[PDB]
Amino acid sequence: MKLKTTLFGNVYQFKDVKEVLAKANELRSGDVLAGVAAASSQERVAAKQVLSEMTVADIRNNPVIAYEDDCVTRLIQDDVNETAYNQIKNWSISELREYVLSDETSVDDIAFTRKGLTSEVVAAVAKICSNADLIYGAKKMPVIKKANTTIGIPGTFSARLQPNDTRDDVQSIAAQIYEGLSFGVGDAVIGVNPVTDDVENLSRVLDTIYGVIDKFNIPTQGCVLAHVTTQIEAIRRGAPGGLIFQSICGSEKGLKEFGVELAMLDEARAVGAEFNRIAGENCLYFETGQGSALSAGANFGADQVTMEARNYGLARHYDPFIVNTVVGFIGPEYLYNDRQIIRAGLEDHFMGKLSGISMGCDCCYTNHADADQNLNENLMILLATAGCNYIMGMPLGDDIMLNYQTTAFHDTATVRQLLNLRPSPEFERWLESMGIMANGRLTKRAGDPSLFF
Amino acid sequence: MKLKTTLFGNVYQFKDVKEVLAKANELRSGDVLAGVAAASSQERVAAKQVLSEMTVADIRNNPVIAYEDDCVTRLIQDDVNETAYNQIKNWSISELREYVLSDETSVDDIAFTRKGLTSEVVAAVAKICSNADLIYGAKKMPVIKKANTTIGIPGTFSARLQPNDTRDDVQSIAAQIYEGLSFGVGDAVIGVNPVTDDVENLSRVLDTIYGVIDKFNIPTQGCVLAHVTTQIEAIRRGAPGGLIFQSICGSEKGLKEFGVELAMLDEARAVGAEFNRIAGENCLYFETGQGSALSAGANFGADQVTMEARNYGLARHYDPFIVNTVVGFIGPEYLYNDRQIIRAGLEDHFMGKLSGISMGCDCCYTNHADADQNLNENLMILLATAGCNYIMGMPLGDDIMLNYQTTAFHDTATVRQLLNLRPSPEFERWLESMGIMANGRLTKRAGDPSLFF
Amino acid sequence: MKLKTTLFGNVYQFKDVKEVLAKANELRSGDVLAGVAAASSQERVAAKQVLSEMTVADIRNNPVIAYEDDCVTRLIQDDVNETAYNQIKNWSISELREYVLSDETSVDDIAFTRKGLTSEVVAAVAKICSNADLIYGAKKMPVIKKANTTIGIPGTFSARLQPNDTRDDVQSIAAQIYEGLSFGVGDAVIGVNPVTDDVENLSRVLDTIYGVIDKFNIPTQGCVLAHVTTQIEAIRRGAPGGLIFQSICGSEKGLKEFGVELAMLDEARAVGAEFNRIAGENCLYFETGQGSALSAGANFGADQVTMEARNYGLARHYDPFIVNTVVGFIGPEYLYNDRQIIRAGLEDHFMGKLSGISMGCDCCYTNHADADQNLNENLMILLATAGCNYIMGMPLGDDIMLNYQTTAFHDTATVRQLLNLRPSPEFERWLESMGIMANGRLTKRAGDPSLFF
Amino acid sequence: ALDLGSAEAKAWIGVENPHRADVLTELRRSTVARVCTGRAGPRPRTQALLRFLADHSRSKDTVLKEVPEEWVKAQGLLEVRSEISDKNLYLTRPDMGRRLCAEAVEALKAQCVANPDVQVVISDGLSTDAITVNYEEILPPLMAGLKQAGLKVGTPFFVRYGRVKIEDQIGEILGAKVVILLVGERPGLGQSESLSCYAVYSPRMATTVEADRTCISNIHQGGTPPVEAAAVIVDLAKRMLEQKASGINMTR
Ligand code: B12
């Protein structure tokens, strides 16, 4: 280990791997808040070069929370293919970056190589990547899963129907579902964040979602995004199980903040296998995002990019159908503006794909962040070129109860027709038979929720 | 017309079309400097709504500099197809936006409709477009021209080789040419901005460019980007004529600032037809960019988006092979940061394509602007999805001489392989014969200027 | 210059380039009438060899009417790319013939090379070409233009609807239009030669044509083939402008015979740009044919093939949408029989394509020529293999007021289905939606003008 | 181990399996452009990206960099400023950079010699380094050029926060027949010492356009040497007074 270079004659010294990981980040508001950011542009570049010259072994053997003290660290470390690790352990992070980006590196090459990574090493690669590096790197690392739809095939682009309501009103949820489907949204999942966290309400919202699914024989899956214990409860007691959701955090302390034990996610897998209406082998759904560990007190002096990578190492253990970052869900204190939210979105998606999870992005912002809808549209298109597995859909992107702006139903149809991308093949076939889609494109009759009536 | 709307109970009044056009702009530092920007987000939206409800006739019949006072206004107005105009003159700008964006509007529909437009109307549509509107709208309006390459075919993506040197040293120009061609850059043009402005030096720079072109039988064209008069002088006296370049401005006073008469561009067309080594029918090359009229004292109270649209109306008269905005060429006083430069890039490109010119973009920034290379990489990819005809290439994007950062040779290869786009078909054939490209992708021994030796 | 060879021991001497051009022609009745023909077969071959050994400079620098005395000569000479000319000026006509015919010569090679030609040089190449030379040579020189249809794409074949009537009766014109469209004729133009040359009648005939076009939303264009001044008058006063027509002749004296000044064709271009209902950039329509200069007193001792080539050099200046020779329009005094009319048709089309105009042919004969309908069918098929851009269509080819026989509506459908050629792509799409065409072929319902009722 | 600002970092060949590596070195020698750095797929190599990022961090500082008032005083120069107060306002307001402040006008009438044939103005503009590196090389032989055989020479003076059009107002107030402005053009990625000369015959605020100016650009040690450029600008000034013309109105 060098923890040291000289830049324009000036010696830059850092204390540990954790500080080098933190200060190599592009400027964001969360790293300044965490106290972990570079003091200058020159120290940023010095941290980047130190990181680049550090080896895979250097980063692997210094996780940001230690093995003994953290079950997520344990889970990440114990999932390593040590044969894959031993092949690459004396690679520099510079060499690993160039390996990932190389056109002579195949999907099958990275398939084995990523098994020798930990999340800290995944983070380290992203930190010395430019924006086009993150986009091209992610594009050449497809991850494909299957529920009742197949997601993540190159040339395809999926979307979550997010039909949220302030009262969980079943007419208002159904209204937004019919609108979303008319734009070809919902092949990732039809997924409601409920107001109330109880079995009767969970089951009623699931009955509404699956009422629509069963009437029109839609190849998709439903989800209610309450706490994982309440989902399991509802499904055991006979509510239709589709995807099972949990928000996750990249430390044990962060999971405790969220009220999650790892054995709940074990249980969710087993409940999925017994109960859930899923043709394929993946039925889990996680959401993540930069800032959450820092909110929780639970980052332990580590930056939010490294902590967010540790989400993906956690998620990978459970082989979910879908994961998305919710990239600007929280506010300006972690990511301040357009530039920071785009960069985070590209980082999050690259790191997800490098970790080998089915990685999408809620391209989003809040009204107290320095941000508008043109940022969502910038980011969703960049990420779609990166082969982002899915985004969200809401009516014009206005969430009326989560109080933020995500992407429109329009935006998925736009991305698909702009970039010549198709839905999930199962869902596309359904859209064609409904008269909503022809040759990847919305028909004249599309965009009209009254088609279903 | 109405110069007036009520928004949340408050009346928003504007003085004229010119003010409505200006305040409808997304926030940029140039409109604030010009004194013409909206005072708030609310007055911006009110301006947008007033603009959207104004007719095509309202904006056609109020150009921002008057017919009798301005030769660019005269050129724009006299080029109108009045039959196409009369069909659309009572359309609102809201209706024209929706017409442009509609999937039931074909390339051939817009081909006739755009002949009824003036530049101010073209500006008016862009001003009420979102970022995804600008990208999708531009994409469904391809513009194809032909020199020794064909540019602008959907599924293709071209690049100017820009081999600039601080002394016009012929070894340094040559070195940058060989590097560019090895990445597949140069199908738009091989185009030097010269230090000295001067027939001996122009001919020597052109001899260097065409030395490489003739040795390897390259389907492309050379250009030297001195003032149009010295180009014409040099070509008349027997230097190789490829593309003939001029920087243009969207008013008569702006052209006088640049030392340009309209009859010089007539002459450049005539000299092209007599002298120039061009197989196709297009041989002119213009560059543009927001802020230039405001710099010249020549915007006449108009915003820089409306002025930039008028560049394209001027350009369209001369049916050039290529035009690009040089989007962040000048600095922060006209476009301050990432978000403003992206927005302007998308505006400029959309407006060019709506004006029916072969529109590209120098995705660029300066070092006194709030900007870095990740912005260039953000913008080049967004614009490539919009079907941007071409960008620049320089070695890592570093201009050693014009003192700014544009896109890398890398970046064109990245865009093409990310988005499954090819070069100009003639240039692609050459790259395949050289062993630089197979199936749209750089071969192993590409990226290496020593291939040519 | 040699003006001299020896053939079988016998010395053949000619006075000038003009005599060599004249006597190298294949035997036709017009050259004998002009007094310019070879006296024997041996002198024909001797003239051919002298011509073949003469250089491009020899022919260029001796036009058949001099620069000072003739505005068409001036127009042809002043349109030369001198750089293209200087490359080829020391080529023999033999070498230029072999260059044109070579499979190693591309479309883009000839694109530049033809710009260094004049019409006399174009004529000289054709004179030493065999019939298969003229056909294969023309086939590998496609010329593509666009009005509301694209014409001249390889693999396509277009047709003029020629719905002429003895009284300009609007029911009889409409009848022939409906019949023509049912056979897939009219993608070049729907074009009436009127009886009476006045604005009210011109406008009424245009209203009838565009009545049909607008009702069925046909991608095509209308034309009334009166004198160009009367067309301009009608269109200014608010008649629908499609294509603007003029018959042309290859000398200034010939234009004066026709009542044409060049500034009328300038005006027609500008009137097109202001008024005309045309999506693409080409809106002019010329007709030509061998014999017209000789009729006018206006050939100045030059043969009719050289004079007809000068039509195409004139036409090329104005970049028309379409040109056709009207190959046997006049009578036996210029082209006597089947063999002469076929040869002229092949010459005319080759020379048009070499001149870079969108060249078709009215394959036709008169009742006082030694000719019948089997000649029309011979020639139309040969020219279709040569990639003739369009022919005429009339009901069985019987023109009831111009008193000659052109090609049937049947003949375009025959050629298309024989040779696997399609209409203009825009027009083909319209035919498919009308149920007239499937896969390039007439449906069962086609050939029936009552389909439109 | 490598400093990214070193000559070894600048000379780095990154091309992985070269067709001809002796050509590669002599191509790298031929230019200051970032050639021959190779690729990883279609993307830049890591060291090339790192050195780019290092050079940009250095470039950002040079736009905010200001010369000491004391350095201007040590050159024997009058310091005057524009309407601009500070570096941050300079970057956003070019219109104020194009006008002398009220105290600047009165200082020029006080302290400078009246109706010169040739007036040299020097301004930091957008790069201080372009002035500070180049000054002693360019300015003495420029002054000794215009004096020795020739003319009524103005006294040279610094304008802080100057944009190019300010030389029209300087021409009007001082009565100058030729105004030469030596000014810092905007900083490149890997250099900051690029000076331009902007020079104009007999300017007027109402009437002078940009094309009326002659530009001599890229004056530094990696461009046209400041000593060599000094004799260029003198010869330009002599031609300007002969022809009574500048910019596009000049012959040849
Ligand atoms: C930025 C820039 C521009 C901008 C200027 C807008 C602005 N507000 O900055 C735009 C895009 C408008 C521009 C246009 C052109 N430019 Co310029 N420009 C530059 C650049 C990169 C920076 C100059 C600078 O930093 N100035 C210093 C700052 C402090 O001055 P400023 O007050 O903020 O800006 C003023 C000057 O930049 C001036 N200016 C800019 N370009 C030119 C060109 C000429 C000939 C003149 C007299 C003045 C001039 O206009 C501004 C005042 O309104 C230089 C390259 C370089 N490395 O210097 C080329 C450069 C000066 N440009 C050049 C040329 C030729 C042109 C054009 C004539 C191109 C063309 N063929 O039409 C046009 C027309 C210029 C005009 N007459 O107005 C050449 C000059 C060659 C010469 N020795 O004559 C240069 C050196 C680049 C090159 N090709 O080598 N340019």
Ligand code: NA
């Ligand atoms: Na934005």
Ligand code: NA
């Ligand atoms: Na016959």
